[PDB]
Amino acid sequence: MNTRRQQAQNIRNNAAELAANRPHPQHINNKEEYEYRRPKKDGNEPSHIANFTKGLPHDEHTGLLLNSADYDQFVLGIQSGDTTDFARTPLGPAELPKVHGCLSKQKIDCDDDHRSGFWKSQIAQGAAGGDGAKLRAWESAGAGLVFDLEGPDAQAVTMPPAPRLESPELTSEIAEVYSQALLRDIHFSQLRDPGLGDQVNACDSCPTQLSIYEAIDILNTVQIEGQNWFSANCCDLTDDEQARQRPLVTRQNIFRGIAPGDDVGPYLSQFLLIGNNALGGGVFGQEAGHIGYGAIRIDQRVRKATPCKDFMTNFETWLDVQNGADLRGLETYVDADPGKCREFPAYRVITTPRDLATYVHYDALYEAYLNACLILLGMGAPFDPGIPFQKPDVEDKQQGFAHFGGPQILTLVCEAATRGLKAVSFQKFNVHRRLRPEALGGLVDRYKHGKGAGDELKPVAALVEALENVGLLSKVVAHNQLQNQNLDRSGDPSSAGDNYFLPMAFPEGSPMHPSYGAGHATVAGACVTMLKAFFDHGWQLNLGMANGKYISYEPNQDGSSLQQVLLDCPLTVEGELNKIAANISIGRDWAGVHYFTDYIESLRLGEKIAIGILEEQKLTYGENFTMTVPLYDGGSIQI
């Protein structure tokens, strides 16, 4: 034998080498960054239209990137990871320099007590209680450079190159995000086959410019150079594309994930709706929506943001946000009904995607998957049989606590997320720098308003044709017109004219970090992988039965309680863990701050981080068990 100090030190050095050995893949992007050129006096320069430029100086009249030098500075700051270099980047409204190539002069500084004059939108002008919206900087630019003690390194895993502005995939993805924005106040019961049960409409019925049927029709129709994304056969697509490609849009599979058990049952996962039976003598059931959070409860009722209210629907509102206008928590919420109990309808069940957008808006990183973990523990879910001390207490004469009990996993789901966020923070800033759906939504408007210099916005031409040829843009301008009749933005000049901008669920829209590499999806992909690995992934959730059919739950018309959907087969631990993983990830697409490619590839990335952690941790345990980890791409891996 060795002394423990030696044994312990080796396990950490063994884990360190194991991680170093595993394939270190090469980071490849779509090359759109320096490809798309725009005119300057000496010649053509990079436009960076396809790139994330939110926070940088945006032309206050044109609406596009003011100076390319700010982007050149912005990149060199990320690549360096230097606090000095990244703070030399101009941020927010800025004036062009007199000498070409020089960095733009920042308008707002540490001597501006009042900032009202710098914003062209009313919402931003009277944001900070009359003073005017503050500037906000880029969130975790050099977090991709930060190392970790467990799991693979941030640059030891990669995501394949993103869709392009001219690609058929991208055109269908933005069309999906546009469709989701107009279906933001649809009742979740609508997003499934009607054979499952009677569907309902949201109690707060309001002006709708698009229906669920039209969205399916449009997504299957939309095509670039006579090719639709879903219709395109395997031969035409690349290896990295074939993996992502989906089938014809169905009423069941619309806006859903592509992992096992996503299509099965209602749209929304049970773990976002159901709770547990009240601790001890059950006062209420699982339909209650109160999770068994040890002794106390977790209320599953999300805050209700004012139905049918979108933001950044005109040029001024959009531009200001793209100039890092800090408009966090300026959205309005429904006041409570004094008569009703449980703060209703101020807090209600997730009825429409509007509520799912509100969920992912402020949710804690592991909250969604910790809650899912707690429901399974409270329900009494069997763990992956491979785990030791799983037999009867009398026979095995051992019980699972610290290393093979509830406590072990409760932390594992939390651990994985920070390992995950660092890994993707690299892909977002250092590698791809893909623009946010809102930014692309801007280009469509800017192009259709014939803005930009010479042939600057020529790349997006092909995209805008396809969207208008399926008559999607025709509805977006009609929707935006009604949204601009609101007193908060009616004073904004651009309200008068037509607006092709993507309606945002939040006033500030997306965060201050690039699109490709979803922060929510990487945490999801990592967290539920740990849950699936630890738990018995197959375990059919028995929520009772009614008339020889398995009971499942979804919101009711006003979100008062859950409504029964009776299925042929029951829902598994995996299926609902795979479905919640989609709900939170795709939930950002409903808000209009992510694409589909952002979800699926981040979900694959997060999984590799999670597996990597578990692989390294198996050196510690001396039992030499096995963990069956089901992958999102069919079959399962043994750990």
Ligand X SMILES: COc1cc(OC)cc(OC)c1
Is residue 224 classed as helix, strand or coil in its secondary structure? coil
Instruction: Establish if 70 lies at the interface with a second copy (CB under 8 A).
Output: no
Selection from ligand X, a second copy, none that 636 binds (CB < 5 to 8 A by kind) is: a second copy
Collect all residues with Cβ–Cβ distance below 8 Å to 80 and sequence separation of at least 6.
Answer: 86
Among 27, 246, 328, 618, contact with ligand X (rule: CB under 6 A): 328
403 is catalytic: no
405 binds ligand X (CB under 6 A): yes
Contacts of 380 (CB under 8 A, 6+ apart): none
Candidates 97, 285, 307, 406: give the one binding ligand X (CB under 6 A).
406
Binders of ligand X among residues 130 to 159 (CB under 6 A) are 139
What residues between 516 and 535 interact with ligand X by CB under 6 A?
A: 519
Residue from 52, 86, 311, 632 binding a second copy (CB under 8 A):
86
Which residues lie closer than 8 Å to 305 by C-beta, 6 or more apart? 331, 332, 333, 334, 354, 355, 357, 358, 505
Nearer to ligand X, 328 or 403 (CB): 328
81 phi-psi bin (left φ>0, alpha ψ -120 to 50, beta other): left
The least distance separating a second copy from the CB of residue 560, rounded to whole angstroms, comes to 14
Q: Which residues contact 403 (CB under 8 A, 6 or more apart)?
A: 621
**Of all helices (H) and strands (E), which one includes residue 86?**
helix 83-86
Q: What span, in angstroms and rounded, lies between the C-alpha atoms of 87 and 102?
A: 16
CA dihedral over 571, 576, 578, 579, signed as positive or negative: positive
Binding residue for a second copy, selected from 130, 226, 450, 624, defined by CB under 8 A: 624
The one among 205, 211, 411, 474 contacting a second copy by CB under 8 A: 411
Restricted to residues 11-50, the positions that interact with ligand X (CB under 6 A) are none
Q: Which of 187, 290, 513, 537 is catalytic?
A: 513
21, 222, 232, 600 from 597: Cα distances, Å: 29, 17, 17, 5
Closer to a second copy by Cβ: residue 179 or 276: 276
Write out the binding residues for a second copy, residues 379-408 only, by CB under 8 A: 380, 382, 384-386, 388-403, 405-408
- From 23-31, 76-84, 315-323, 398-406, give the range in contact with ligand X by CB under 6 A: 398-406
Site for a second copy in 91-150 (CB under 8 A): 91-92, 97-103, 105, 108-113, 134-143, 145-150
Taking CA atoms, 206 is separated from 13, 268, 278, in Å, by 61, 22, 37
- Where residue 567 falls (left for φ over 0; alpha for ψ -120 to 50; beta otherwise) is beta
Residue 508 or 536: the one with the smaller Cβ distance to ligand X is 508
Give the orientation angle of helix 168-182 with respect to helix 437-448, to 10 degrees. Answer: 100
537 given a catalytic annotation: no
Question: Which residue among 58, 290, 432, 520 is the active-site one?
Answer: 520
CB of 93 to ligand X, least distance (A): 19
Number of chain positions touching ligand X (CB under 6 A): 8
Segment interacting with a second copy, rule: CB under 8 A, options 5-13, 171-179, 491-499, 597-605: 5-13
Q: Residue 81 CB: number of other CB atoms within 10 A?
A: 16
- By a kind-dependent CB cut-off of 5 to 8 A, residue 328 interacts, out of a second copy, ligand X, none, with ligand X
Peptide bond into 388 cis (omega under 30): no
Could you say which of 287, 363, 468, 488 contacts a second copy (CB under 8 A)? 363
Using CB under 8 A, pick the residue from 41, 225, 487, 638 that binds a second copy: 638
| Binding partner of 43, given ligand X, a second copy, none, CB within 5-8 angstroms per partner class | a second copy
**C-beta separation of 145 from 336 below 8 A:** no
Question: Which of 190, 270, 317, 418 is in the footprint of a second copy by CB under 8 A?
Answer: 418
Residue 401 within binding range of ligand X, rule CB under 6 A = yes
- For residue 331, how many other CB atoms are within 10 A of its CB? 20
Three-class SS of residue 435? coil
Q: Which residue is nearest to ligand X (CB)?
A: 511
Residues 212-251 that bind a second copy (CB under 8 A): 233-235, 238
**CA-to-CA dists, residue 455 to 96, 459, 501, angstroms:** 21, 8, 21
Site string for ligand X, 175-194 (x = CB under 6 A): --------------------
**Active-site residue set:** 513, 520
Could you list the residues that contact ligand X (CB under 6 A)? Answer: 139, 328, 401, 405-406, 508, 511, 519
